[PDB]
From a paper:
The present X-ray crystallographic and virologic study demonstrates how SARS-CoV-2's main protease (Mpro) inhibitor resistant variants emerge when SARS-CoV-2 is propagated in VeroE6TMPRSS2 cells under inhibitors’ selection pressure. The X-ray crystallography data with mass spectrometry data obtained in the present study clearly show that all three Mpro inhibitors specifically bind to the enzymatic active site of the enzyme through the formation of covalent, polar, (and halogen) binding interactions, causing the dimerization of two enzyme protomers. In conclusion, the present data show that the structural changes in the target enzyme (e.g., Mpro in the current work), which certain amino acid substitutions bring about, compromise the enzyme’s integrity (e.g., protomer dimerization and the following structural changes), loosen the binding of potential therapeutics to the enzyme and cause resistance.
The kcat/Km ratios of two newly generated recombinant enzymes, MproWT and MproA191T, were largely comparable (286.55 and 115.04, respectively), suggesting that the A191T substitution does not significantly alter the Mpro enzymatic activity. When MproA191T was examined in association with nirmatrelvir (7.5 and 15 µM) and TKB245 (7.5 and 15 µM) in further native mass spectrometric analysis, dimerization of MproA191T protomers clearly occurred, and the dimerization profile of those protomers was virtually the same as seen with the dimerization of MproWT protomers, suggesting that the A191T substitution exerts no significant effects to the dimerization process. The less-binding profile of 5h to MproA191T is in line with the structural features showing that A191T substitution disrupts the interactions between the distal ring of the indole moiety of 5h and Ala191, pushing 5h molecule away from MproA191T, resulting in less anti-viral potency of 5h with MproA191T. Such disruption does not occur as nirmatrelvir.
Residue numbers in the entry:
A (entry chain A), B (entry chain A): 1 to 306
Amino acid sequence: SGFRKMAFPSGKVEGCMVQVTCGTTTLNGLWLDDVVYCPRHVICTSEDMLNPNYEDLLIRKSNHNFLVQAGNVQLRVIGHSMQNCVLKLKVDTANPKTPKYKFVRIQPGQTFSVLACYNGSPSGVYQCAMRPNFTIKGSFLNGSCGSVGFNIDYDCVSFCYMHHMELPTGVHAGTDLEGNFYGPFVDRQTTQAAGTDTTITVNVLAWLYAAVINGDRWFLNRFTTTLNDFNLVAMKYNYEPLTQDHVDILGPLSAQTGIAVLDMCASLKELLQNGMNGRTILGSALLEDEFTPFDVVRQCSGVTFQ
Amino acid sequence: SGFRKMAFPSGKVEGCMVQVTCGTTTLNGLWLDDVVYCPRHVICTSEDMLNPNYEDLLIRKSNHNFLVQAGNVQLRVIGHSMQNCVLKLKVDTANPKTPKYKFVRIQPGQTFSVLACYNGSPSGVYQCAMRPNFTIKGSFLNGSCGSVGFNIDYDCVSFCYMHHMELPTGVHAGTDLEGNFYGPFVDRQTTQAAGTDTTITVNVLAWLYAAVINGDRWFLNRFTTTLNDFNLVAMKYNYEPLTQDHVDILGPLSAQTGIAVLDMCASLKELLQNGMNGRTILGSALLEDEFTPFDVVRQCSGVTFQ
Ligand SMILES: *C(=N)[C@H](C[C@@H]1CCNC1=O)NC(=O)[C@@H]1[C@@H]2[C@H](CN1C(=O)[C@@H](NC(=O)C(F)(F)F)C(C)(C)C)C2(C)C
Ligand SMILES: *C(=N)[C@H](C[C@@H]1CCNC1=O)NC(=O)[C@@H]1[C@@H]2[C@H](CN1C(=O)[C@@H](NC(=O)C(F)(F)F)C(C)(C)C)C2(C)C
């Protein structure tokens, strides 16, 4: 019944976006209750950003130095603090469209939806994955910072990402909502390299399950294997180790398609050795690693929100 | 700065979704002002759907036979009519979250965002294209019908699709919001075939422009060509004819990258002849045809909504 890179619906989060201006720098903010969270480099000028001293810049700021606009309405700031690489502006108005929400810090391999924004206005929404090198393959221009990444569980928005910077290779980096970066990056304009990226094995298998459910079954073989042996052949192709926790997490997909997890591992071994020989799987000639087990289940069983 | 299959933010449309039940059939509705639009096969039973007589079924229905739920709130129906394959239920309450909206009928080649819903609740959002054979490569399960496709221009939602049925090959079919199908399909459970699908040439070129902007330039050659000659080589590969209107529509991307449209056509000719020889473009080993000129411009210049 089809299989696509699907994102969460964005309305709950659109109701939280605002514009934060400080001097001439403008970027995005998240308004939740009476607090606005945004990247702390909003207090910089251009020339500060090469090697900035944030605490020093913040001393010279008052409440009134921050311009916070929700649509046309201006939000008076009544306090400011800095928490790691994020900035919290207390405001005089609680956001009446605040959803149930929590702040989470995802693990490498987990996915989320990004609502890319400019000037506090939503431009578009797409689904990303936290790569094992702690980067994301997103799409962002100048002024995108403060755009956020999230998951929805029924009614609760789990905010897990806030965008800060783009790295030499076209990939992106940021923080959780407490302002700690993911990976070894810092918020300054200096040379930073990513680290080598490894392929998320459990997400590939999840995608192969997605393919069977959808009738694409040519890659299934009749063989099995052991976790140990599988992991030796994967290592060579820069695939992450598959833990037993991964196997257990794949149990629901295993149960529903009646294909033991270690059979699917066998099928993947073959694909890593022999290549596809010019065939596709779900429309793709490359093995895809940006869908979690949970993503496959929600899409191929039709889970909804609110 | 990255390039992804990006969808419009969905909040404006989420505020319009409702659940329509009639007998035991439940599917999705669109509530705009005081009218709910949904697929007319909500009035069927299972066994009716093999060869249904819709006008006959609707005679036997009253207002009170339709259960319309917006969240927990029930909407009293105060009238019903049928317009082609869509059904309009007048209700006693106008939807206070109705956006500025219009109903449009897109052309093959145009893209839009689908908000897949079940039981009047949003499950996820993704971007599709109206294929030249008048199908879409979507992702839908039972109960998805009435989910809608749309574009946003600043503040106005242009609704262009409503989902009705899935075709033997995993692809999907539906109507505009006046209830006319796209392509030769009808709303009955009988064998229907798609027609052969052709590749949308102008969208491919747009994607190649997207690639240059993003620094991927290996496929550019030094040669030019004529529209005429180009179109002869494309025909063989089941690529649509490139009209002069297409060339003009590509003028903004041409202007910004300083690459005449007919140079890019030359570069595409080579790719259709020689293949990629194992290289990628924007991460893909296949030429991609699901981004319009307009989509590339909005994403790679950062257009926002509201
Ligand atoms: C936030 N609004 C922008 C978003 C950027 C702009 C281009 N694409 C994006 O994702 N973030 C920044 O401009 C951050 C910000 C200063 C510099 N910066 C960068 O993203 C730069 N990157 C780096 O210096 C590097 F190489 F370390 F990654 C830039 C050269 C502009 C891509 C600060 C405070 C780090
Ligand atoms: C609306 N809620 C569903 C959505 C379907 C279910 C599976 N994926 C979808 O997109 N639509 C239907 O069930 C429509 C509906 C009766 C039958 N139908 C179909 O989609 C069927 N297709 C066809 O009969 C065919 F081959 F012509 F395309 C089905 C076999 C269930 C896929 C009506 C009124 C056409």
